[PDB]
Amino acid sequence: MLEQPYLDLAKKVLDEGHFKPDRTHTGTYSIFGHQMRFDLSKGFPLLTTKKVPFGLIKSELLWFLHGDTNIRFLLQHRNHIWDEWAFEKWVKSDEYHGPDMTDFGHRSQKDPEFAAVYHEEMAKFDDRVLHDDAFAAKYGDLGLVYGSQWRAWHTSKGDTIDQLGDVIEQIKTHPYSRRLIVSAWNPEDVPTMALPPCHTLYQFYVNDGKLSLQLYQRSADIFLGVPFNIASYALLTHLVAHECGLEVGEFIHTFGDAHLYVNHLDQIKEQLSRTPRPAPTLQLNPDKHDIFDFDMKDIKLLNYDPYPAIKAPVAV
């Protein structure tokens, strides 16, 4: 059924992945090299075997599409996928006051009592970013995320290349190039990088009315990472295709290091004893059009009938 590529991967890892020590200690079973496909005219790859939140991944996506770096947008649409970072930018400066922030989430899922001091420290700052403007302006900014990457690349003669923008106009302009590419890997930077872009590069291809997209992703967490990345890039594609007036073909995903966390071997097994239910569908607001002004109500998802959800340890 559409999402079966992930199960064939989830299996295949558990099954022939090597034990690698990751950037922490956490065991990972790994595959290097895999490509996987989904025919978006037949449906949406939200996994129906583990409920995934659409509201969460759409808000983040649009905030990417808005060239926005500031962690505030998200806070307005109670999304918290990017906070932990701004906190290190915050706890590290000369203004941080009070406590032992000195690790916060790395001793949350097991700790101390951290969740009353890390999460109160955290809510106080998340609450601050949402109201104090000079504050927002200060720590909530994050810098180089995919929004700045995609919509305003930094150039060698001080400007800003809206790489994406230009690639959607390149589609209208002529269907055919092997050059409809939006990179997010900037070699200059990855010295001073927080989280390097995982979903390192992509490419679009028009072909007789079906748009398609290929994503090269340096690494995958096949439990928490991959369910949300397969969807983000499918919403982008439905959104990029409706802007330059096309219809939608497939989505193709290519990973460098797909790996599943040694913490998560139990929990995948749990999904693998499930048996898929049909794919959800997606209404794309048909009067609205310059996709950078898609507002959240313009992407209403229909028919999402998921299984219950599984409990992960944090990917450290």
Ligand X SMILES: O=c1ccn(C2C[C@H](O)[C@@H](COP(=O)(O)O)O2)c(=O)[nH]1
Q: How far is the CB of 264 from a second copy (least distance, A)?
A: 17
Q: Name the binder of 81 from ligand X, ligand CB3, a second copy, none, CB < 5-8 A by kind.
A: ligand CB3
The answer to whether 220 is annotated as binding is yes
The binding site for a second copy (CB under 8 A) comprises 18, 20-23, 30, 32-35, 37, 153-156, 158, 161, 163, 176-179, 181-183, 185, 187-188, 190, 196, 198, 200-201, 203, 205, 207-208, 212, 214, 216, 218-219, 250, 252, 254, 256-257
- Rounded CA-CA distance 260/258 in Å is 7
Reading the block at residue 239, the tokens are 């959104």
The distance in angstroms from the start CA to the end CA of the chain is 32
Is residue 197 involved in binding ligand CB3 (CB under 6 A)? Answer: no
- Rounded CA-CA distance 163/62 in Å is 16
Q: How far is the CB of 168 from ligand CB3 (least distance, A)?
A: 23
Q: How far is the CB of 68 from ligand X (least distance, A)?
A: 17
Q: Name the binder of 254 from a second copy, ligand CB3, ligand X, none, CB < 5-8 A by kind.
A: a second copy
Q: Name the binder of 70 from ligand X, ligand CB3, a second copy, none, CB < 5-8 A by kind.
A: none
- Rounded CA-CA distance 142/67 in Å is 12
Our CB check for a second copy shows the closer of 74 and 211 to be: 211
Question: Kind of pairing, strands 27-39 and 18-21?
Answer: antiparallel
DSSP state of 161: B
Contact 239, 299 (CB under 8 A): yes
List the one residue out of 272, 262, 258, 256 whose CA is nearest residue 316.
Answer: 262
**Cα angle value 282/234/161 (rounded, 5°):** 120
CB atoms within 10 A of CB 153: 17
Our CB check for ligand CB3 shows the closer of 204 and 228 to be: 228
Is residue 230 involved in binding ligand CB3 (CB under 6 A)? Answer: no
Question: Kind of pairing, strands 250-261 and 247-248?
Answer: unpaired
Is residue 221 involved in binding ligand CB3 (CB under 6 A)? Answer: yes
The one catalytic residue in 57, 198, 226, 244 is 198
List the one residue out of 227, 218, 226 whose CA is nearest residue 197.
Answer: 218
The verdict on whether 244 is a catalytic residue reads no
Our CB check for a second copy shows the closer of 111 and 257 to be: 257
Is residue 228 involved in binding ligand CB3 (CB under 6 A)? Answer: yes
Q: Name the binder of 312 from ligand X, ligand CB3, a second copy, none, CB < 5-8 A by kind.
A: ligand CB3
Span 278-307, contacts to ligand CB3 by CB under 6 A:
none
The answer to whether 238 is annotated as binding is no
- Rounded CA-CA distance 310/307 in Å is 10
The binding site for ligand X (CB under 6 A) comprises 22-23, 177-179, 198, 219-221, 225, 229
- Rounded CA-CA distance 164/148 in Å is 11
List the one residue out of 189, 207, 236, 224 whose CA is nearest residue 316.
Answer: 224
Unique residue bearing structure tokens 């995903």:
253
Q: Name the binder of 181 from a second copy, ligand X, ligand CB3, none, CB < 5-8 A by kind.
A: a second copy
Query: C-alpha 209: how far from its chain's center?
Result: 26
| Active centre residues (catalytic) | 198
Q: Which residues bind ligand CB3 (CB under 6 A)?
A: 81, 195, 221, 224-225, 228, 312, 314-315
Annotated binding site: 23, 178-179, 218-221, 229, 259-261, 315
Q: Which residues are annotated as a binding site for dUMP?
A: 23, 178-179, 218-221, 229, 259-261
